[PDB]
């Protein structure tokens, strides 16, 4: 059974760095190239890096060239993605995937994904002249907003459960 | 750079309906060596990785029923579902797998017609139905966590300013 497990996601500020990991099992790791593919919030799929089975060839799209480095430890069955100079735009679910070095058929094996979030709206230089009281009001106000958005997700899934529940009750 | 255009973006479907999806490539995906189309179709359910559906434009992958047909060549490709079923509701992506950079279409999303769930699910057993009911919880949880993370980001500058005092 082929399995792939990402890890290393985190929430970080722009210009930070981060290293992702992928544990591989169920196949001969050193016989296959590997890839990283991410899914941004608009749910677009963007290929981000590929490495050959032996590690000596690496490929990147122009959007991460010079910032992302893909690497592998073939004795440890591990694939890596170092991400530097992170932009807000790099926010996505990052997927580990096997390169089909023999079938040449696309991506058949993916991991579960690890979330990278690079924060937007992080500069606070304009907030420094506020009074601490007003900063508290602005800080506290995010709570009812965040609770309200969470409650809409709950409403949405209540709506999705209901036809399935109705069909269950009908037997 | 190869651009893949998937049309239409979204489709509202009733059970049993035929479904036609379009993937257009700006350059040919006809491989120099073997003259197959290096065009791969994926099906993605929420909270899940994309799952490989068709490769070489027209070869179905293991477990994929013959309801599905990939067709077309070079630059104009089609995914056809002769008779859509609830388990087919998903986003469908096509991928240029022939030349770097690898690129993907924006996806064609299949959605059931409002009020139509009973007809989609009329053959489902209670076992099948419970499984579909339990699958909703990871998707909900993943969506909620995007909120928590969004608001952690919104809080940090305010917190940073407050600590600067």
């Amino acid at each position: 059974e082929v399995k792939l497990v990402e890890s290393g996601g985190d929430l970080v500020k722009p210009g930070g760095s981060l290293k992702l990991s992928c544990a591989a099992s169920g196949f001969t790791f050193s016989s296959y190239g590997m890839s990283w593919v991410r899914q941004t919030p608009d749910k677009r799929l963007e290929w981000v890096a590929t490495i050959s089975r032996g590690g000596s060839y690496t490929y990147y799209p122009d959007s991460v060239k010079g910032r992302f480095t893909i690497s592998r430890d073939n004795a440890k069955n591990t694939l890596y993605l170092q991400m530097s100079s992170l932009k807000s735009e790099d926010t996505a679910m990052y997927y580990c995937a096997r390169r089909e070095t023999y079938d040449e058929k696309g991506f058949a094996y993916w991991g579960q994904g690890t979330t990278v979030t690079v924060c937007s709206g992080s500069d606070y230089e304009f907030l420094k002249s506020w009074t601490v009281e007003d900063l508290q009001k602005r800080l506290l106000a995010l709570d009812p907003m965040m609770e309200q958005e969470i409650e809409e997700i709950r409403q949405k899934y209540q709506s999705k459960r209901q036809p399935i529940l109705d069909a269950i009750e009908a037997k | 750079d190869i651009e893949l255009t998937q049309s239409p973006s979204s489709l509202t479907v009733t059970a049993g309906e035929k479904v036609t999806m379009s993937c257009k490539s700006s350059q040919s995906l006809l491989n120099s060596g073997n003259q197959k189309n290096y065009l791969t179709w994926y099906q993605q359910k929420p909270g899940q990785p994309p799952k490989l559906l068709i490769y070489w434009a027209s070869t179905r992958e293991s477990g994929v029923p013959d309801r599905f047909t990939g067709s077309g060549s070079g630059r104009d490709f089609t995914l056809t579902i002769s008779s859509v079923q609830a388990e087919d509701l998903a986003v469908y992506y096509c991928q240029n797998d022939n030349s770097h950079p690898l690129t993907f279409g924006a996806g064609t999303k299949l959605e059931l017609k409002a009020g139509s769930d009973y007809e989609f699910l009329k053959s489902w057993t209670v076992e099948d139905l419970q499984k579909r009911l339990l699958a909703l919880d990871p998707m909900m949880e993943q969506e909620i966590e995007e909120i928590r993370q969004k608001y952690q980001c919104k809080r940090q500058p305010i917190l940073d300013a407050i600590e600067a005092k």
């Binding site: 190239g33 590929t50 050959s52 032996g54 590690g55 000596s56 060839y57 490929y59 | -």
Partner: peptide, 8 residues
């Protein structure tokens, strides 16, 4: 011992 580039 004998690496292989990517096919794309």
């Amino acid at each position: 011992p004998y690496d292989v580039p990517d096919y794309a």
